[PDB]
Subunit: 61 residues, 3 copies
Amino acid sequence: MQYITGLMELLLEISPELGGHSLLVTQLTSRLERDFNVHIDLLTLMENPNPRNIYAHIAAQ
Amino acid sequence: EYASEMNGMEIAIIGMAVRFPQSRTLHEFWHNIVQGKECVTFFSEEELLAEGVEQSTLDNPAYVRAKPYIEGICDFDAAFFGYSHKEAQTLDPKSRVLHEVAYHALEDAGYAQRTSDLITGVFVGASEDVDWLRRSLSQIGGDALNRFESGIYGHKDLLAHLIAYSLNLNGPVYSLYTSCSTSLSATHIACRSLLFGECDLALAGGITIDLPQKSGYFCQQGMIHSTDGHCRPFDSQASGTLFGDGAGVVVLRRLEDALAAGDRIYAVIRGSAVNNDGKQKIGFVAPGHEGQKAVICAACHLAEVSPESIGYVETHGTGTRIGDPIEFAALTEAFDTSHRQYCALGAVKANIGHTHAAAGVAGLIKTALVLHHRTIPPLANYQMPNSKLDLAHSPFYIPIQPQEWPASRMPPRAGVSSFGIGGTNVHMILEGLNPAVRDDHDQVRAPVFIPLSAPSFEQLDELTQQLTPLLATLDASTLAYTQQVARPVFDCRRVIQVENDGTQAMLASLDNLMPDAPWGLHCPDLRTTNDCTYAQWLAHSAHYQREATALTALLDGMNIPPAYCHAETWAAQANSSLLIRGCQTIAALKTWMNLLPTLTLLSGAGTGLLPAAAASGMIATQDVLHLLWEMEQKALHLWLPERHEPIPGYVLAWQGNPITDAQRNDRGFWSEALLADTRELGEGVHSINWVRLPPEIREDVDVLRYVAQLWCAGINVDWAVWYGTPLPQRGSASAYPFAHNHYPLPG
Amino acid sequence: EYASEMNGMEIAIIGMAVRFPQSRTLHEFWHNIVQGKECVTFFSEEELLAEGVEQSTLDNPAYVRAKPYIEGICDFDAAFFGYSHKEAQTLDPKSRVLHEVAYHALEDAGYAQRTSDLITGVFVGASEDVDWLRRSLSQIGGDALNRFESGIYGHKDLLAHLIAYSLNLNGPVYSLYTSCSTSLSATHIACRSLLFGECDLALAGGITIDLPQKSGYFCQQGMIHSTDGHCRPFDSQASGTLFGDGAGVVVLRRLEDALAAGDRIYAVIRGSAVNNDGKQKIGFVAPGHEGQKAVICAACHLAEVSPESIGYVETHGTGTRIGDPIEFAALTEAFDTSHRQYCALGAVKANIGHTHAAAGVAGLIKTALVLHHRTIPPLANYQMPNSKLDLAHSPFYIPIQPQEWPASRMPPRAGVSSFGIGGTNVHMILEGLNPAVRDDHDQVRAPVFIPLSAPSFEQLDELTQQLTPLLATLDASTLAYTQQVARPVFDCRRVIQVENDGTQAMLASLDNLMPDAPWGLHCPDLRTTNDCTYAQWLAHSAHYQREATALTALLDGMNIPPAYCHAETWAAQANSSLLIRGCQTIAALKTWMNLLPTLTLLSGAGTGLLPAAAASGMIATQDVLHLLWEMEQKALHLWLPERHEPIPGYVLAWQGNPITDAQRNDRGFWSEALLADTRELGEGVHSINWVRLPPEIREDVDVLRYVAQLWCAGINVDWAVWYGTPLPQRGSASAYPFAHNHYPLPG
C-alpha cells in the first residue's frame, strides 16, 4: 500500500478515490502489484475505487 | 403519403449507398442484417506472413487475429472522373473510395448528371490514422511544385472539395470532425443548413480506412479492446469492442419538394439535438449520464413526438462491461413512461464491428432500411442478459427472431443515437413512410422493356450480368420505368425484355440502315386510305390529348362544322370528315416529332402536305385550319397562304425531294402536288431512313417495341411522352459498372 | 441605440482578442493598423545559423530571409486551466496558445466567470502543417496507453473539445476546415446556429503556427511566393504573397439579448453567404470570377442593404500579379451602381502577411474596429496603382493617409471578403453602431475607484503596471465601473484612486483590524442623535428609495398626521419627531445589509433596539411602527409583540453582548433595557469589528472611499447597490496576467 501511494504521489504529486482512475493509472498500478508480494486481479482492478478496498482485497488474497 | 401533421421542419432521405465489411451494396446489407449474421473474419498464419508481420509477435499471446476489412481499397476508375494516371497515383485511399461511394449515392437517388440547376452541396467528415502519414513522408523531395501537389492532394482535409469539384457541385462544403460521431454531426448541420433555404441536396458522409489491411490488433487488459475477437452488446458474456473499417453516404432533401417531384423516400428525419457533456464527467475520455438523458429528452421534445410511440431505439452499444448499464439507465430515465416491454433495441456494432468515424451513418442507414422494409431484425450474439440490467420494470425487450412490425404502433417511429468518446452527443427521431397500395391487380398485362447502357462492351457485359438478383428482389414495372427515365445514357447499348413470368429475352436489332441518312415520317393519302399516320395506338398518350384539346380550341371557333366538336369520339366516324382526319394527322405527327428529337423530314404523298407545312412551321395554323373546312365544300377557288418562315430543321419534302426556295414561291407546283401518286416507295432511293411500323402489329406494345428498337439504333427518345395518365412510380434500379485498374500501395 | 429597422437576422460582436505578429494585444493592433507600418521582420546572417540552418542553404540566392513570427510560442500557464505538469508538457502549440486567447475573449466580453446560466458553443477551425508531424511521428510513443494519450491530446482534431472542457462550456462543438477561409466559415456556422435557438454565445477563429519560428522561405518561379520579402497588394511592383502566423477569437450573441442586458457592442453582423466556385474555372488552384460575383450579390440581397451605402470594402487582396485585376473586376461588377469613386478599400495582408487559417478573422476584427472607431485606415504599401486596373471609372478609391468617416455615408456600413483556394468563398456585410455620448463638459467630476485583484503579489504588480497605457487611451469612469462589477475577484487585493487629472495614488491600508471576527453595526439612541445610522449619504443610492417607497406605502394605511406620509421629504422635518428617524433607520439598515453581504451581528442601545429588531426580523414592521408611535406621544402601556427566530444568518444584540436565546420572553428585561434611557457611548471591549465611519466626512464620495477601504480587506462587497438611477455604461478594462513557465520543444 505504501509503494502504491508512493507511485500515485510520484505520478500526481499532491502531498495531501480522487486519483487518476483512467487509461494509464489503473494499469500502471496493476502491473507492479502482481510483481509485488500482494496478489491483485483484473476483476478487483475494475471493482475497487480506493486503496482501502484494494488493501482489503490484499488481506483477503 | 405521409399521414401526420406537417410542422415546418422535416427532412427526407432519398437514397443511400454503403461499402461495409462483407457488404458491397445495399441489398447485401439488408440480407446481412435480417439473418443476424456476423461480418468479422479470422485469419491464419499463412496469409499473415505474406503481409509482412514479424514472427516474434504471432507467438505473443496479445495478437488476437481478426479485423472487419473493406474488400478492394486499391482500385479506381481514373479517366472517368477527370484525373490522369500520376494524379490518380498520388491519392490517399480515403478519397479513392469516397469518390465511387458518393457517385453511387447520387445515382441511386435519381439525380445523376442532372444537378446543373440545383444548388447541391457536400458535408462529409473523415478521421485519420497515422500509418499512411508514415508512408507518405518517406519520399524524397526539395519542396518543389510536385511537393506542393502532394501537400494538398495527400491531405486528409481536402476531401469534400475534391468530391464537389469532380462532380460539379456549387454549394456549401465543409469537412467537419467531432470525435466518433462525425457522421451524425455532419448530418445534423446538413439538416440545419437545408432548412434555412440555402442548398437543395445535401450529402452526409464519413469514412475511415486503416491502411495495413489483413492484420490483427493488440489487446490489452486495462482497456476496452475485446480479448476474444468478438463483439457482443448487452450480453452477460461481453468483453469489449472491435475497431474496423467502413464507408457510407446519404442524400437529404426537404419534404415538400420531394413530395412534389415524386421521388423514392425511405424515412423522414424529424428532430435533432446536440450537446457537449462538459466538465460533469470524471476526466475527458468517458461520457456521463445527465448529458445522455438531456439529449434524448431534447430531441424527443423538439420534434413533437411523445416517447410512448417509439418502437425501435438503435443504441450506441459499444459492448463494454461498464458503458452498457449506463446507456440502458439513461434510456430508461428519458422515456418517462410506465408501460411495460413495448420497444425493441439493437446495435449494428455486433454485425460489422465499430467503424471509427462512420458509426453514426451506419446507424442511420440501418434505421432507414428498417422503416422502409418493416421488419425488426435480431440482435446478433445475444444469449442471456447482463446481470446489472432489469428488463422487467422497464420498456425494452431484446428481439431474437425477425418479426413483422406490430399493429397498434402505426405510423412507425424509431430513434437513432451515437455518443462520442469525448462528449458530443447526437439523437434523431425518425418517422417512416406509409407505402402505397400496388394496384397492378396481378393481371396478365404486358411485357415491358429495360434500356441498359455503358460506354464499352466489357462494362456492358457486367451490367447485363447484374440484372438477375435485381429482377429477383424488386418489381419489374417500376424497375423498367426508373431505368427509362432517371438514368444517363452512353454509347454502346442493348435492350433486355422482361415477360410476365420472369424470363429474359434479348431484343433483336435492325438489319438495313445507313449512318449518314437522316430520319423522317410518311403521310398517306386521306381520300383513299382512311388510316391515319399511326394514330390508331397513340390515343392513350397524355401529350396527344393535350394537342387534341389545343386543336379543338381553334377548330370550333370560326369553321362551325355540322355539330362535330369538343374532340371526343373520332374513333366512331373517322372515315367521313376530312377536317378531323387532317386534325388527326396534325396531332399524330406532333406527338411523333416530340417523341424523337432527331426527326427532321415530315413528308407525305397526297392530302397531307398542308398539315405537313402546318406542323413543320412553313405555314401558320390559322390559314390551314381555315382552308381545311372550306376544302369540304371544294367549290370555290383555292387559297395561297402567307408562306411564313419555318423553324431551323423540319424541312419538308414531297416525294423524297427536299428543296428550299425553289418551288415555295410559285403556284404551279402547289396546284400540281394535290394528286394521289399511290406509291409508298415512290422515291426509289434517296438515302432517307423511314419511320415505318412493322407489318405484323396488333397490340399497342408493338409500337413501343419499335420505339425501343430505335433507341437501340442510336437516337435518343422522349420516353415519358408515351405513358398515360397514371405515371408509374419511380424507384431503385441498378448501379454502375466501374472498370478497375490496379494501383500499388506506397511502401 | 442602433437607428435602423430590425428584422430577425442580427448578430452582435461583444468582444475580441488577438495575438497577431508584433501585436500581442488589441490596442497595439489598432495602432499598427492606423499608422500603416508593417509587422514583418528581417534577419541577419547569424540568427538563422543559431537555430538549425546549415550554411549550405544560406549562400543560395533564391532564399529570402523573412517570416512574420509570433513571440511566445513556447510558454503556458500550467495549473490555471486544471492541468498537471506532464499533461501540459505533451500538448501541441496551437492548443497551448488558443487556450489563452479564448480566455481573453471571455474576459473582455464581461462574462468571465458567470457562464452558469447560458448555453455556450464553440466553433474553432485550425490548420496542420508537416513539420510538427515529422517531429512527433518519429518520437517514441510508448505502449498502447501512452499512444492513446498522445493521439487523443496531441493532435489538431481534439482542439475545440479541449477548449470546451477546460473552461466550463456545454453547447455544441465542432472543428471545421475549408482551407483558407476557415475562420469565416466557422463564424458563418456560428451565426446560423445562434439564430435558431440552440446556443446563447459562440466563439470563432482559427490558429496557425509553423514550428521553426525564425526561418526563411524558398522563393521560386511556378508557385507564387514573393521574390523580395514584401507583400504589396494592388501595386505596380507587386511580387507575391508572404506566409505568416496568427490567432484570434470573437464572441457572438443575438441583438435583442445584447441590448436588453446592457453589454458593449462593436459592430453587428447583418448578412452572410457561402458558395463554392464549382468547376466554373480552369484549374483547381486558379481563382474563378463568377463565384465571387454571385456570393457578393447574394449577401447584399440577404441582408436588405442596397450597395450604395457601403462605405468601406475589406477585400482578400492576395498581392500576386493575377489575383488583383480579377478581384477588382469582380467587385466592380457586383456593385452595379454606375457612380464614381466613393468607397475605400484595404487589405490586412500587407500589415501582417497571409495567415493561412485566420485570414478571415483578421479581416473581421479589423473591420469591426474600423466601424467602432470610425477612421478609414491607409493601405500599407502603395505608391502607384496596377497597370490594368481601371480605377477612375470604377466605384472605388484607395486611401494613403488616415481620414475620418465621410459624413455623407451614415450609418456606417462595411464589408468583409475572404476567398479560399478552390473552396468556399465567404462574404459578410457588417454595420456600425451609433455611439453613446457623455454628458460632461470637462469638469472636476469626482475621484473614482479601481479595484485590482490577482492571486499573488507578483501577478498583482504586473497587473497594476497596466493602468498607464489603459488610462492614456480610454476614459477613466467606465474603466472603474467595469473593474467594479463585471470581472471576477481573487485573494490578494489593492485599490487605486484616480483623481480628476491623472495622479494615481494607492489607497491607504486599513489598520486596527482583528481577523476571524464577525462584522457588526451599531445605531445609537434616537432621542438625541440625528445621524440615523448614516442615512443622509445613502439618499442617492436608488436602493434606499425603494425601501423608502415600501415604508411609505406601509405607513399610508394607518398613520394619522399627513406630511409624514410623503416620501422624498423626510429629511426636512426629521429633526422634530421620532417616527421619521425610525423610518430612516429601517431603510439605512437594509441598504447597509445589501452593501456588505457578510455583515452579521446587528445591535442597538436604547430606542434603537427596536429598529435594529425590525431590520433583523425578530418582531414585525407595522407593530414596530405604531409601537414607536406610542413611544412618541404616550410611552404608557407598552404592548410587547411576540418574537420570532429572525433569519438564518443574523444575530441581534443589546450592547455588544449577543442575546443568543438569552431571555427572549421576559417582559422585565425589555422594559429595563428600554424604558429609562441609555446615554452611554458604550462598546468597551468585545471581539467584533464595527462599521464606523471616520470623523472627517464632508462630501458624498467619502463613504465610497471608506467602502473601498473595506474592500481592500476581506469583505466581499457588492459593487452595484451604491450607484444612482442612471447606471454608467459598461465598457472595456484590464486583462489578466498569466504565470509563465517554460516548456521546451522536442526537436
